[PDB]
Design an enzyme around this catalytic site. Sequence first.
Site, PDB file in Angstrom:
ATOM      1  N   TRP A   1       7.341   0.094   4.659  1.00  0.00           N
ATOM      2  CA  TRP A   1       7.608   0.987   3.537  1.00  0.00           C
ATOM      3  C   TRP A   1       9.093   1.296   3.435  1.00  0.00           C
TER       4      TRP A   1
ATOM      5  N   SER B   1      -2.207  27.410  -5.810  1.00  0.00           N
ATOM      6  CA  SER B   1      -2.000  28.823  -6.102  1.00  0.00           C
ATOM      7  C   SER B   1      -2.751  29.229  -7.359  1.00  0.00           C
TER       8      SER B   1
ATOM      9  N   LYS C   1       3.634  30.895   2.800  1.00  0.00           N
ATOM     10  CA  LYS C   1       2.818  30.509   1.650  1.00  0.00           C
ATOM     11  C   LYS C   1       1.331  30.493   1.998  1.00  0.00           C
TER      12      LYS C   1
ATOM     13  N   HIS D   1      13.326  12.709   3.219  1.00  0.00           N
ATOM     14  CA  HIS D   1      12.597  13.951   3.457  1.00  0.00           C
ATOM     15  C   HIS D   1      12.468  14.800   2.192  1.00  0.00           C
TER      16      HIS D   1
ATOM     17  N   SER E   1      13.230   6.283 -13.802  1.00  0.00           N
ATOM     18  CA  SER E   1      12.217   7.001 -14.564  1.00  0.00           C
ATOM     19  C   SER E   1      12.053   8.425 -14.053  1.00  0.00           C
ATOM     20  N   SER E   2      12.013   8.598 -12.731  1.00  0.00           N
ATOM     21  CA  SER E   2      11.845   9.943 -12.193  1.00  0.00           C
ATOM     22  C   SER E   2      13.065  10.818 -12.453  1.00  0.00           C
TER      23      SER E   2
ATOM     24  N   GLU F   1      12.047  13.474  -0.446  1.00  0.00           N
ATOM     25  CA  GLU F   1      10.991  12.714  -1.095  1.00  0.00           C
ATOM     26  C   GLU F   1       9.616  13.235  -0.707  1.00  0.00           C
TER      27      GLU F   1
ATOM     28  N   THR G   1       6.412  27.595   4.796  1.00  0.00           N
ATOM     29  CA  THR G   1       5.057  27.133   4.531  1.00  0.00           C
ATOM     30  C   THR G   1       4.040  28.076   5.149  1.00  0.00           C
TER      31      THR G   1
ATOM     32  N   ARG H   1       2.942   1.567  15.959  1.00  0.00           N
ATOM     33  CA  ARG H   1       2.564   1.538  14.555  1.00  0.00           C
ATOM     34  C   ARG H   1       2.864   0.177  13.944  1.00  0.00           C
TER      35      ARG H   1
ATOM     36  N   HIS I   1       0.827  -1.204   0.000  1.00  0.00           N
ATOM     37  CA  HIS I   1       0.000   0.000   0.000  1.00  0.00           C
ATOM     38  C   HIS I   1       0.860   1.251   0.000  1.00  0.00           C
TER      39      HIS I   1
ATOM     40  N   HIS J   1      15.391  13.896  11.378  1.00  0.00           N
ATOM     41  CA  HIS J   1      14.270  14.177  12.261  1.00  0.00           C
ATOM     42  C   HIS J   1      13.264  13.037  12.196  1.00  0.00           C
ATOM     43  N   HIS J   2      13.592  11.987  11.447  1.00  0.00           N
ATOM     44  CA  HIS J   2      12.801  10.769  11.399  1.00  0.00           C
ATOM     45  C   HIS J   2      13.372   9.661  12.270  1.00  0.00           C
TER      46      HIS J   2
ATOM     47  N   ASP K   1       5.987  21.513 -28.144  1.00  0.00           N
ATOM     48  CA  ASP K   1       6.239  20.238 -27.482  1.00  0.00           C
ATOM     49  C   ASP K   1       7.497  20.283 -26.624  1.00  0.00           C
TER      50      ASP K   1
ATOM     51  N   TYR L   1       8.919  16.400   0.593  1.00  0.00           N
ATOM     52  CA  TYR L   1       8.679  17.726   0.026  1.00  0.00           C
ATOM     53  C   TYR L   1       8.656  17.742  -1.494  1.00  0.00           C
TER      54      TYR L   1
HETATM   55  C1  HEA Z   1      -0.050   8.425  -1.064  1.00  0.00           C
HETATM   56  C2  HEA Z   1      -0.041   8.331   0.255  1.00  0.00           C
HETATM   57  C3  HEA Z   1      -1.037   7.576   1.024  1.00  0.00           C
HETATM   58  C4  HEA Z   1      -2.391   7.580   0.893  1.00  0.00           C
HETATM   59  C5  HEA Z   1      -3.205   8.367  -0.098  1.00  0.00           C
HETATM   60  C6  HEA Z   1      -2.935   6.726   1.847  1.00  0.00           C
HETATM   61  C7  HEA Z   1      -4.244   6.413   2.062  1.00  0.00           C
HETATM   62  C8  HEA Z   1      -4.789   5.737   3.115  1.00  0.00           C
HETATM   63  N1  HEA Z   1      -4.087   5.065   4.054  1.00  0.00           N
HETATM   64 FE1  HEA Z   1      -2.060   4.902   4.117  1.00  0.00          FE
HETATM   65  N2  HEA Z   1      -0.042   4.877   4.356  1.00  0.00           N
HETATM   66  C9  HEA Z   1       0.836   5.565   3.610  1.00  0.00           C
HETATM   67  C10 HEA Z   1       0.517   6.399   2.566  1.00  0.00           C
HETATM   68  C11 HEA Z   1      -0.709   6.714   2.084  1.00  0.00           C
HETATM   69  N3  HEA Z   1      -1.889   6.190   2.571  1.00  0.00           N
HETATM   70  C12 HEA Z   1       2.190   5.306   4.074  1.00  0.00           C
HETATM   71  C13 HEA Z   1       3.444   5.891   3.490  1.00  0.00           C
HETATM   72  C14 HEA Z   1       2.111   4.466   5.093  1.00  0.00           C
HETATM   73  C15 HEA Z   1       3.259   3.923   5.898  1.00  0.00           C
HETATM   74  C16 HEA Z   1       3.371   2.407   5.773  1.00  0.00           C
HETATM   75  C17 HEA Z   1       4.264   1.920   6.878  1.00  0.00           C
HETATM   76  O1  HEA Z   1       4.387   2.598   7.865  1.00  0.00           O
HETATM   77  O2  HEA Z   1       5.208   1.008   6.612  1.00  0.00           O
HETATM   78  C18 HEA Z   1       0.658   4.187   5.287  1.00  0.00           C
HETATM   79  C19 HEA Z   1       0.122   3.368   6.254  1.00  0.00           C
HETATM   80  C20 HEA Z   1      -1.202   3.281   6.540  1.00  0.00           C
HETATM   81  C21 HEA Z   1      -1.745   2.605   7.636  1.00  0.00           C
HETATM   82  C22 HEA Z   1      -0.982   1.895   8.716  1.00  0.00           C
HETATM   83  C23 HEA Z   1      -0.503   0.513   8.314  1.00  0.00           C
HETATM   84  C24 HEA Z   1       0.035  -0.112   9.569  1.00  0.00           C
HETATM   85  O3  HEA Z   1       0.082   0.558  10.570  1.00  0.00           O
HETATM   86  O4  HEA Z   1       0.070  -1.447   9.679  1.00  0.00           O
HETATM   87  C25 HEA Z   1      -3.077   2.729   7.582  1.00  0.00           C
HETATM   88  C26 HEA Z   1      -4.023   2.147   8.586  1.00  0.00           C
HETATM   89  O5  HEA Z   1      -5.202   2.050   8.335  1.00  0.00           O
HETATM   90  C27 HEA Z   1      -3.383   3.483   6.439  1.00  0.00           C
HETATM   91  C28 HEA Z   1      -4.655   3.792   6.065  1.00  0.00           C
HETATM   92  C29 HEA Z   1      -4.978   4.543   4.947  1.00  0.00           C
HETATM   93  C30 HEA Z   1      -6.291   4.891   4.555  1.00  0.00           C
HETATM   94  C31 HEA Z   1      -7.548   4.500   5.282  1.00  0.00           C
HETATM   95  C32 HEA Z   1      -6.219   5.614   3.428  1.00  0.00           C
HETATM   96  C33 HEA Z   1      -7.372   6.215   2.663  1.00  0.00           C
HETATM   97  O6  HEA Z   1      -7.175   7.627   2.618  1.00  0.00           O
HETATM   98  C34 HEA Z   1      -7.464   5.695   1.231  1.00  0.00           C
HETATM   99  C35 HEA Z   1      -7.090   6.813   0.249  1.00  0.00           C
HETATM  100  C36 HEA Z   1      -8.302   7.597  -0.184  1.00  0.00           C
HETATM  101  C37 HEA Z   1      -8.250   8.405  -1.217  1.00  0.00           C
HETATM  102  C38 HEA Z   1      -9.241   9.531  -1.320  1.00  0.00           C
HETATM  103  C39 HEA Z   1      -7.101   8.353  -2.189  1.00  0.00           C
HETATM  104  C40 HEA Z   1      -7.514   7.552  -3.424  1.00  0.00           C
HETATM  105  C41 HEA Z   1      -7.689   8.468  -4.608  1.00  0.00           C
HETATM  106  C42 HEA Z   1      -7.938   7.976  -5.798  1.00  0.00           C
HETATM  107  C43 HEA Z   1      -7.824   6.503  -6.063  1.00  0.00           C
HETATM  108  C44 HEA Z   1      -8.279   8.889  -6.940  1.00  0.00           C
HETATM  109  C45 HEA Z   1      -7.008   9.184  -7.732  1.00  0.00           C
HETATM  110  C46 HEA Z   1      -7.319  10.219  -8.781  1.00  0.00           C
HETATM  111  C47 HEA Z   1      -6.622  10.282  -9.885  1.00  0.00           C
HETATM  112  C48 HEA Z   1      -5.143   9.996  -9.848  1.00  0.00           C
HETATM  113  C49 HEA Z   1      -7.206  11.001 -11.072  1.00  0.00           C
HETATM  114  N4  HEA Z   1      -2.222   3.811   5.797  1.00  0.00           N
HETATM  115  C1  HEA Z   2       4.032  14.596   2.893  1.00  0.00           C
HETATM  116  C2  HEA Z   2       4.940  15.542   3.104  1.00  0.00           C
HETATM  117  C3  HEA Z   2       5.268  15.930   4.481  1.00  0.00           C
HETATM  118  C4  HEA Z   2       5.153  17.182   5.014  1.00  0.00           C
HETATM  119  C5  HEA Z   2       4.675  18.414   4.293  1.00  0.00           C
HETATM  120  C6  HEA Z   2       5.555  17.146   6.344  1.00  0.00           C
HETATM  121  C7  HEA Z   2       5.606  18.137   7.289  1.00  0.00           C
HETATM  122  C8  HEA Z   2       6.463  18.184   8.360  1.00  0.00           C
HETATM  123  N1  HEA Z   2       6.974  17.087   8.957  1.00  0.00           N
HETATM  124 FE1  HEA Z   2       6.597  15.179   8.384  1.00  0.00          FE
HETATM  125  N2  HEA Z   2       6.392  13.256   7.804  1.00  0.00           N
HETATM  126  C9  HEA Z   2       6.177  12.868   6.540  1.00  0.00           C
HETATM  127  C10 HEA Z   2       6.053  13.728   5.465  1.00  0.00           C
HETATM  128  C11 HEA Z   2       5.754  15.063   5.487  1.00  0.00           C
HETATM  129  N3  HEA Z   2       5.911  15.843   6.614  1.00  0.00           N
HETATM  130  C12 HEA Z   2       6.099  11.412   6.505  1.00  0.00           C
HETATM  131  C13 HEA Z   2       5.862  10.571   5.282  1.00  0.00           C
HETATM  132  C14 HEA Z   2       6.271  10.968   7.744  1.00  0.00           C
HETATM  133  C15 HEA Z   2       6.270   9.529   8.174  1.00  0.00           C
HETATM  134  C16 HEA Z   2       7.664   8.951   7.936  1.00  0.00           C
HETATM  135  C17 HEA Z   2       7.772   7.592   8.569  1.00  0.00           C
HETATM  136  O1  HEA Z   2       6.921   6.619   8.217  1.00  0.00           O
HETATM  137  O2  HEA Z   2       8.630   7.376   9.390  1.00  0.00           O
HETATM  138  C18 HEA Z   2       6.468  12.176   8.608  1.00  0.00           C
HETATM  139  C19 HEA Z   2       6.688  12.229   9.976  1.00  0.00           C
HETATM  140  C20 HEA Z   2       7.354  13.259  10.581  1.00  0.00           C
HETATM  141  C21 HEA Z   2       8.090  13.243  11.779  1.00  0.00           C
HETATM  142  C22 HEA Z   2       8.291  12.095  12.721  1.00  0.00           C
HETATM  143  C23 HEA Z   2       9.041  10.926  12.108  1.00  0.00           C
HETATM  144  C24 HEA Z   2       9.088   9.899  13.200  1.00  0.00           C
HETATM  145  O3  HEA Z   2       9.636  10.260  14.368  1.00  0.00           O
HETATM  146  O4  HEA Z   2       8.244   9.038  13.204  1.00  0.00           O
HETATM  147  C25 HEA Z   2       8.577  14.480  11.989  1.00  0.00           C
HETATM  148  C26 HEA Z   2       9.413  14.916  13.154  1.00  0.00           C
HETATM  149  O5  HEA Z   2      10.513  15.373  12.941  1.00  0.00           O
HETATM  150  C27 HEA Z   2       8.169  15.283  10.924  1.00  0.00           C
HETATM  151  C28 HEA Z   2       8.483  16.605  10.803  1.00  0.00           C
HETATM  152  C29 HEA Z   2       7.786  17.474   9.980  1.00  0.00           C
HETATM  153  C30 HEA Z   2       7.785  18.888  10.045  1.00  0.00           C
HETATM  154  C31 HEA Z   2       8.548  19.724  11.034  1.00  0.00           C
HETATM  155  C32 HEA Z   2       6.986  19.362   9.074  1.00  0.00           C
HETATM  156  C33 HEA Z   2       6.714  20.817   8.790  1.00  0.00           C
HETATM  157  O6  HEA Z   2       7.297  21.166   7.537  1.00  0.00           O
HETATM  158  C34 HEA Z   2       5.221  21.134   8.716  1.00  0.00           C
HETATM  159  C35 HEA Z   2       5.085  22.555   8.169  1.00  0.00           C
HETATM  160  C36 HEA Z   2       3.636  22.965   8.084  1.00  0.00           C
HETATM  161  C37 HEA Z   2       3.160  23.873   8.898  1.00  0.00           C
HETATM  162  C38 HEA Z   2       3.739  23.944  10.285  1.00  0.00           C
HETATM  163  C39 HEA Z   2       1.750  24.356   8.690  1.00  0.00           C
HETATM  164  C40 HEA Z   2       1.737  25.763   8.096  1.00  0.00           C
HETATM  165  C41 HEA Z   2       2.410  26.737   9.026  1.00  0.00           C
HETATM  166  C42 HEA Z   2       1.756  27.738   9.555  1.00  0.00           C
HETATM  167  C43 HEA Z   2       0.295  27.935   9.253  1.00  0.00           C
HETATM  168  C44 HEA Z   2       2.533  28.864  10.178  1.00  0.00           C
HETATM  169  C45 HEA Z   2       2.424  28.757  11.696  1.00  0.00           C
HETATM  170  C46 HEA Z   2       3.284  27.615  12.158  1.00  0.00           C
HETATM  171  C47 HEA Z   2       4.311  27.870  12.919  1.00  0.00           C
HETATM  172  C48 HEA Z   2       4.106  28.749  14.125  1.00  0.00           C
HETATM  173  C49 HEA Z   2       5.692  27.727  12.338  1.00  0.00           C
HETATM  174  N4  HEA Z   2       7.422  14.525  10.081  1.00  0.00           N
HETATM  175 CU   LIG Z   3      11.058  14.607   7.162  1.00  0.00          CU
END
Ligand code: HEA
Ligand code: HEA
Ligand SMILES: [Cu+2]
Lengths: 524, 47, 59, 239, 74, 64, 265, 49, 76
Positions: free
Chosen positions: A129, A258, A321, A243, A159-160, A245, A318, A440, A64, A292-293, A94, A247
């Site tokens: 994952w 926007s 923005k 990370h 590819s990417s 990845e 952010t 988790r 998934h 930070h992960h 093109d 952003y």
């Molecule tokens: C793309 C990122 C993404 C998305 C969209 C989702 C979607 C969902 N995820 Fe997923 N999830 C992850 C990324 C994502 N997840 C990741 C990275 C993990 C970590 C795995 C791990 O830790 O090892 C995780 C793990 C994770 C867990 C924990 C697994 C574990 O703990 O054992 C669970 C638990 O229920 C969960 C639930 C769901 C649910 C209910 C949705 C629902 O939101 C289903 C999505 C619903 C939608 C609305 C999106 C579908 C949209 C379309 C199909 C239309 C597309 C349109 C076009 C392209 C035109 N996710």
């Molecule tokens: C999808 C993209 C995405 C984005 C945008 C972010 C946003 C941020 N993430 Fe996230 N993060 C993930 C992807 C992402 N993350 C994923 C995939 C995981 C799970 C990885 C795993 O499975 O281990 C994770 C988990 C994760 C962790 C914990 C990992 C672990 O311990 O398990 C941490 C902690 O360092 C972290 C940090 C942050 C921070 C500081 C931001 C910040 O950039 C958030 C910034 C946004 C704002 C804060 C909101 C807008 C701000 C305001 C409106 C202004 C006011 C706010 C302030 C006063 C500054 N992220």
């Molecule tokens: Cu990160």
Amino acid sequence: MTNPVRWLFSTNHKDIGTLYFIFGAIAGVMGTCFSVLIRMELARPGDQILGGNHQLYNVLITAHAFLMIFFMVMPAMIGGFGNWFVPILIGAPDMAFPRLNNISFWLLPPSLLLLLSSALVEVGSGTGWTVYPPLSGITSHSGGAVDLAIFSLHLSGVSSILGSINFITTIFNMRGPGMTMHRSPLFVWSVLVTAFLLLLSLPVLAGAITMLLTDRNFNTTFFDPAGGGDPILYQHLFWFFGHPEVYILILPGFGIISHIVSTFSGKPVFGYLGMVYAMISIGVLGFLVWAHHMFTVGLDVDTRAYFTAATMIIAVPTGIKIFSWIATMWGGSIQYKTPMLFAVGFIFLFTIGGLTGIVLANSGLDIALHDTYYVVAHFHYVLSMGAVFALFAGFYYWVGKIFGRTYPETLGQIHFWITFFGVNLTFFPMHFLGLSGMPRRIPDYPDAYAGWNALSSFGSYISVVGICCFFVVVTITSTSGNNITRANIPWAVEQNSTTLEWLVQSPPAFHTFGELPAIKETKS
Amino acid sequence: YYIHAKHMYNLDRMKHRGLKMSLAVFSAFSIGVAVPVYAVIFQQKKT
Amino acid sequence: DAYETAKWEKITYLGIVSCTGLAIYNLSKGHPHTEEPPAYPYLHIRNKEFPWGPDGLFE
Amino acid sequence: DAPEPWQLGFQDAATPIMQGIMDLHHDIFFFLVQIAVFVLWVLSRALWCFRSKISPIPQRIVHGTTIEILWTIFPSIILMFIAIPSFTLLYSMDDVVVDPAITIKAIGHQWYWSYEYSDYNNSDEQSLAFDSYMVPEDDLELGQLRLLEVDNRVVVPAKTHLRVLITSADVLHSWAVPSLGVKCDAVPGRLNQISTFIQREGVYYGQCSEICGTNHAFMPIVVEAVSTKDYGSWVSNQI
Amino acid sequence: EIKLETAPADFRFPTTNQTRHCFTRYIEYHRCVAAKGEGASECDKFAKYYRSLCPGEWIDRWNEQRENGTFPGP
Amino acid sequence: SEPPFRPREKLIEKQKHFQSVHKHTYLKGPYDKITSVAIPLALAASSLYLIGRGIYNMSHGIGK
Amino acid sequence: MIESQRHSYHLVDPSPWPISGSLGALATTVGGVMYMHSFQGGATLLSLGLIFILYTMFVWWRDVLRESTLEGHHTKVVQLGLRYGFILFIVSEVMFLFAFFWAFFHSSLAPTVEIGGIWPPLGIWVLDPWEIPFLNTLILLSSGAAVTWAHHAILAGKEKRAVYALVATVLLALVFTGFQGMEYYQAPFTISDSIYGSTFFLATGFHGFHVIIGTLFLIICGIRQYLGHLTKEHHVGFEAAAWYWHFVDVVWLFLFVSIYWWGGI
Amino acid sequence: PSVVKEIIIGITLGLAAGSVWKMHHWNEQRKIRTFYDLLEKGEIGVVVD
Amino acid sequence: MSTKYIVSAILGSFGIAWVCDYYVSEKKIFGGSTPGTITNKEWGEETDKKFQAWPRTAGPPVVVNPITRQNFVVKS
Ligand code: HEA
Ligand code: HEA
Ligand SMILES: [Cu+2]
Ligand SMILES: [Mg+2]
């Protein structure tokens, strides 16, 4: 034979965009089926449908995660919207390097086949994952599933990289006349920045998983404890990819939002240079923090302090923005169509996700909250809500353009409301459970946590209803017997448009340009 | 061929387009929700 | 125009002359190996046997 | 100490570390609820007072000054305020001024833990070593929890310092008991040090937080904090 | 009657690598056993320290390696 | 100044030949007929069959 | 003609080499797995996929050469775009080898307790960093000088000595790969040794593979220059070759310094 | 429409919500402090018998 | 215009989700099991009475969750 040539062979950046969209839809449906299976297993304590075989559950979560984080958002933001609307929007014929475009897209489906066959071979890849070394070692798996998954990651990464080189050279070289860099729209700018991140970070992931592969099969000792080479090395490398990845999955979302806000507020984006510089700084500071992960693994105190500071600093832009977007709605003449609905939902739910992220960014708080469903709630709001809602907003806003037809409005709003309610019900209890302390990635939970996981399980089915509604919308659009008008939509009827792509045709003809645009460029 | 066409798709022309697009989207959904289930079915069919 | 070509021609010729001399130096060395080290735990590990198992490639 | 049905927030604390964690999270949540409510309010008032029926004229402003610098600066001081306590917690949690009184290695095997209170033996071979197996479903009495009860729990004297050396033997693991606020990773090569100091008696439960192979979440951890006299009696009886 | 004491907090290792702490204590005890041998007091001190620190599997494996002559490090 | 080992009019003749045909890029020339309709085609067919057989065997755990 | 097209950019015509190359990559990957784990079809599938990728790459470069040399579709702007793309590719490769260097350094600054807390591990007979590796550095340095000589041959209008410089460079690159092979065969330690041997051999092997591909790039440019496909004003293939070879030399310099000098100290 | 008035009222509502949350947190902290204070110097023990 | 349709469809979606949940996790149209700890229906009872006095291996029974449950012994 002419149709197979036009599809399997043609370069035609628009057609590659269409193929990318179809692949993205298929991958999304596959990922949602895996998510529903996960939720079905986790509905009640005990063995629900898996009947044992927690290895299969771990395989399901891995598949998934890969499917939706690599084959759904990236083929839809970059390949889907990027391929189409970079050269059309920038005012160019093109795309540069069309053959690279085609090879990247046709590399993707073999990567999909590898991933599924990795989920299907002798037992499976139950490593999560983020493939960690010692579990993915040959002592603990000995299957080949991890080898197939690693090669899947190689194909997707190559590819990417090809796509990123394509986009960088196109933006730097293939612009129109008179169009200075500071007149290309923010979608083009976000695609440029995300392409730079994809070009710089992704090879590190390729190196890390190549090293994992030669650790498994060709019997090296990079991640074997006896002989040096701690697994911390792999943690560092994979997250130095990880990370940047994450952003990348959201920057094209920022660009599309926007554009949508600009076209619905009757006014362009407030603080244009602010937007550009904030997005460049997000790109730059996406690299200077990667551990930070892994706060709870044993780094010294000074590294933890530094990464705390880095995450706060990456939080600031952010905020700039989001406040800029709020400003560029103070003008007036809003109009609440479905793209505006989804942009507004994006802003709200991404705000919630970002604040949770801040809570997670500290060190001690991550000591208490590492690998608990608090993190799952954080990145499911951020990633799912942000990326997918921006995706839906872009899809409506520009299915006004691709096919030439237009969706029915009541169904669009119904789909927005269904999906919003379902996917915002199903992920907030994840916050509560993470605070309670459940780990988790578990197939069974103690009896105490059974209270909410029955409620969250009630959220997945609503989202399934929403996705089925979305596909009904797509079919009724492709068979809608009523073309694009002024009563239906007021966008494409503009004799004057901020963005170049609305004043061309219903679909672009074949070259998108009988003759390139110009710019007056006064002060003779 | 339609390189020299006013519209790249010109979707209206094909034969009633309705059954074709309906089957297309339904088969897309079938491939999206058949293989993920089939993987689990095969894994339980195994040991 | 051509002075640069002449100059890099000269220094590349110097480079290949020095390299050929150094190759003559390096060759004609017997290279007698010293005794095998004691079998420390971290040497000669076999996590998963090679496809051409018994001995590593290039041996 | 143990998980609760329909519970909001953290469990109970038995460590100064966990007190610090609760306080830091509450300060962070105070600042961030302020941020979130303000942003939601401004967004709502912007959407609602300009809803195509009051203001049908775009009003065309694109360049802003002396407000962009304001929302660039004010979030900065917000971040400074929410990073003042975190640094203090880190640099007051790291220091161990006092000597640890015991030493409890926690070797994280594949799907079950092990422990050795080795600092009581005159020989080289270690005495007082045991294994921490999860109790199966049918081996429970009418009261205990499910998949979270352990045979031969960890015993620890209360109100006196500790030092647990987390490490593994097969694959990655993590020693994680939340009520004490202790989580760290057992990596097969390193020996992580955790200094903790419980404040009250009773039993505390926790689980593995890292993907081990197949019986993950069936590899739980139980720590008892008992009076020093009883701990002495138990150790002398176990030797 | 029980002892209720263990290895002290060493200034050299304020990080979280009692892996280095383990190896250092082991090396000091064997430097005792080599050079002094009859400094039984201080070297029982060092012995108690590394027994408290190093896990049993590591201690046993290293003792067997030392006997076999394949013990890396001093 | 010296032309490199060819008269350079053979290249001009080849340019005339290539610009004087009415096909796509990859089918120009008599060499490319054989090449780009027989070699990649049969090669991809064999590759596809072997890939299918290999995936089947790996999934089923047969033919070690 | 441009006056009807109204823009000087390039518009290519369809070619199945993208899809064919992707199929070749899938063949190579499944063959790689089926040979990594013992299976009946492994070796033959891997070899077939590898030659498939080689063939598609060959016909692809042939098609690009055909277009740009005989049809003449390359204008100034697409000429610039090709340079842009290749600089980006070199940046990607730089980051890849950076990841490998990070692996080495993270494994060699603070050696673990289990290799004695020292480096190099006891019982690994490090190569003298001055007998063969110094000769390899000198050979690549002379090769870089020869590439610059070839570039100033092409630029200065002297289009005959360019083939002489290119053939000299190819000879030096072949000498280098031969001496690297001799070093591999005479190695006093294999890959399956400690982290030292492992990282040494992985990094050095990928560097040698990049040397092979750069050498074959140079061979292609040499054949083209002999045939007359390059001119003083319009030549990008040679510029790409020169940049790639300079990349390989710089990577070798960093590799030599870090691994051979420091690691042996 | 007055921009400064809207931002002022937003800041004021944010501070009100933060003050409510801080009052909650202060009450919880007082409960913990008095519990441990008694646990050392009061009737409260933790072992039942 | 459509608020009738939107609200009606939202309520219908909740109904459909409920029906699917009821068939898939209450009666298990797809095979599965239920723990012995929840079907006994008296397990929570003893779990709470045991939070009052949790058994221990070395020492008399001791309480759990003292703060958040406000349960603890007096002068003795
Ligand atoms: C793309 C990122 C993404 C998305 C969209 C989702 C979607 C969902 N995820 Fe997923 N999830 C992850 C990324 C994502 N997840 C990741 C990275 C993990 C970590 C795995 C791990 O830790 O090892 C995780 C793990 C994770 C867990 C924990 C697994 C574990 O703990 O054992 C669970 C638990 O229920 C969960 C639930 C769901 C649910 C209910 C949705 C629902 O939101 C289903 C999505 C619903 C939608 C609305 C999106 C579908 C949209 C379309 C199909 C239309 C597309 C349109 C076009 C392209 C035109 N996710
Ligand atoms: C999808 C993209 C995405 C984005 C945008 C972010 C946003 C941020 N993430 Fe996230 N993060 C993930 C992807 C992402 N993350 C994923 C995939 C995981 C799970 C990885 C795993 O499975 O281990 C994770 C988990 C994760 C962790 C914990 C990992 C672990 O311990 O398990 C941490 C902690 O360092 C972290 C940090 C942050 C921070 C500081 C931001 C910040 O950039 C958030 C910034 C946004 C704002 C804060 C909101 C807008 C701000 C305001 C409106 C202004 C006011 C706010 C302030 C006063 C500054 N992220
Ligand atoms: Cu990160
Ligand atoms: Mg962790």
